[PDB]
Design a protein around this ligand. Sequence first.
Ligand SMILES: C[C@H](C(=O)O)c1ccc2c(c1)[nH]c1ccc(Cl)cc12
Ligand SMILES: [Ca+2]
Ligand SMILES: [Cl-]
Ligand SMILES: [Cl-]
Ligand SMILES: [Cl-]
Lengths: 365, 360
Amino acid sequence: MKFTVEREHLLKPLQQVSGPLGRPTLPILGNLLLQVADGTLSLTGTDLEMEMVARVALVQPHEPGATTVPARKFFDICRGLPEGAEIAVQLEGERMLVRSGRSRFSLSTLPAADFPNLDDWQSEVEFTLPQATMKRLIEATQFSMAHQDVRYYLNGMLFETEGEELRTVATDGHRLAVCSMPIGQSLPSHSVIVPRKGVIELMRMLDGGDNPLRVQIGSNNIRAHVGDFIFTSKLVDGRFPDYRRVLPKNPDKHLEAGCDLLKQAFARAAILSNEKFRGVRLYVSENQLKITANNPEQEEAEEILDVTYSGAEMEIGFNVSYVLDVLNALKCENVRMMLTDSVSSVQIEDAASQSAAYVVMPMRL
Amino acid sequence: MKFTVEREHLLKPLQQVSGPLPILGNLLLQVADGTLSLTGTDLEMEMVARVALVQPHEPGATTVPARKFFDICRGLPEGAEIAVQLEGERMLVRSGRSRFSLSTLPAADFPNLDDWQSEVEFTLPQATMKRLIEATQFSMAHQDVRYYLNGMLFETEGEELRTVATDGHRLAVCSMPIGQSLPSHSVIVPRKGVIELMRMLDGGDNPLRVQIGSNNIRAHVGDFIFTSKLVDGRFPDYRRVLPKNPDKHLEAGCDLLKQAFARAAILSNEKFRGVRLYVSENQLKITANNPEQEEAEEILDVTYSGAEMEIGFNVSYVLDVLNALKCENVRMMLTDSVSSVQIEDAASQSAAYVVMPMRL
Ligand SMILES: C[C@H](C(=O)O)c1ccc2c(c1)[nH]c1ccc(Cl)cc12
Ligand SMILES: [Ca+2]
Ligand SMILES: [Cl-]
Ligand SMILES: [Cl-]
Ligand SMILES: [Cl-]
């Protein structure tokens, strides 16, 4: 295996394929697989649950073969060479040599044949969509995923295809986010859970250019192709909660207000909320929202805002971090809150669109 | 105690005094003679900021939680007016229809640095003080048992102010002219003090007044006053640290040398990163290896005079120097494999660096 490649054509691929990898559990999992075949250098990184592959075209002389080498060390070497450096690589059994100018490096190898390899699988649905749509879908919901919950299915994001819609859903059992976007082709009904790190990888591979994303889903795997990057993950083997059953059934009290005005008021009140429980109290009355916070030390914050509200007065408590997370994800002019009573969840949406919806349970407070 | 002031006028003061037990997490607010003073302290140093009060106000003082008060002010909208009124065990803060009640501790409980007397005084541009500290601060010790190294020497000599910092392995010294004849004097400022002083100094052209006592230093710029205790011990004499007669001279591009060190270090021991330098006629070779038997080699074209020699260095020590220099060409002055080396910018003799070698 031999190749020579310009520094900048190797650098972003190395960064991308290292995504799935600080302290590898076993050494080969801290390595990348390098493969030269048919005019292409392929680079692969994996954590045993997902893999990221980059294809790099070779315009300079090369010889086929494969090995694995430490990802961080190889990336750092390539990054540290000067702009435009020509990076020559040659496999020499238990070592891989790297040379550029009068810089020389020898890296320890492990066999390509020992590199873990996600199984082949069969796609059952395939579709294309703009990068921006996938970005919107994930950014709208990712913050509501659980983190290290014993309920493993919640530490992932539901991807659901239905008719001409792709939908993401995330929840940690306290708050839920759901987003639906049209794709312009009719899809079979599929519902799959993508693991935490996989959602991060999908997000990371979106360059923000005009390349479309091609998605394939099977029973136990998902794959996304963007440019010369191919991401594949195993799916989480569980049954996700149904968002339709958690949306409040008849939330007739409707509040409308400016997103940023609400966000900044909640942020200020939060300063004097209980440090652990983060509770704020909302008092809604005719065209007015009062937000109060107090902590065990008896300090107090009060914010009064002009809003549009016609329903009955009520008082309801929320974890202010859950509210702030939603307002931060909406990034819109105006927000609608849909309330029922003091012991029931609130539904929050962009006043302009029902494409995303957020459900937050109240606090006893 | 009552005042009303624009948020804008509080922001910089608040960030400055939030820099240094429970009452130490509070700020002292004092209204007197048409001024609001804000003070923060950690018992070893204090920062005072003053803000003029044109709106009606009433004298008095209290202490409130620093981070809470700062976060409230910062969290209010651009252009906000902030009204404050003391109500016994609470301090009321009002802006528009935002209202806050903070718990207070009495002003009388707020720690004061003992009064002291100035012995040496001079004014210099804050830019000069920044340059002196930036040139040297990275060589201070952190939490050494030799407490006098956990800080920076400030020395006046002739017409110069000099800073010296060392951790026992490497040393930095920088001298700048201040345009007046000074007494010969030296004090050690604690490292946390150095960092707080440095953070008080922005990019402006602004006179800085320094007053040094037996046990304290004070620095005044604009409407900020920083005071710190000094460290009471015997600081090493940099003159005895500088190589006395280096007979080997290496000159190389600063950035080329930096990047070669940085690359080679990738394959050094991760827990203790060093490289070997081999100097010979017109060339520098830098090598590294690790327990996995991985190896790096860098060859540079350099200007060199002297006998061939091999010498090792701690990567971080050399990188810290080259990053501080930010110049075109660097000079290294060597003696032998077991002796310290001096490193300087080829085009400036304002700062010098000494680094002990590392055995590999
Ligand atoms: C503790 C002792 C001292 O004189 O205080 C000390 C302080 C600084 C240094 C040293 C020994 N030995 C050294 C060798 C090299 C350098 Cl750069 C600095 C030092
Ligand atoms: Ca809107
Ligand atoms: Cl190339
Ligand atoms: Cl090579
Ligand atoms: Cl004012």
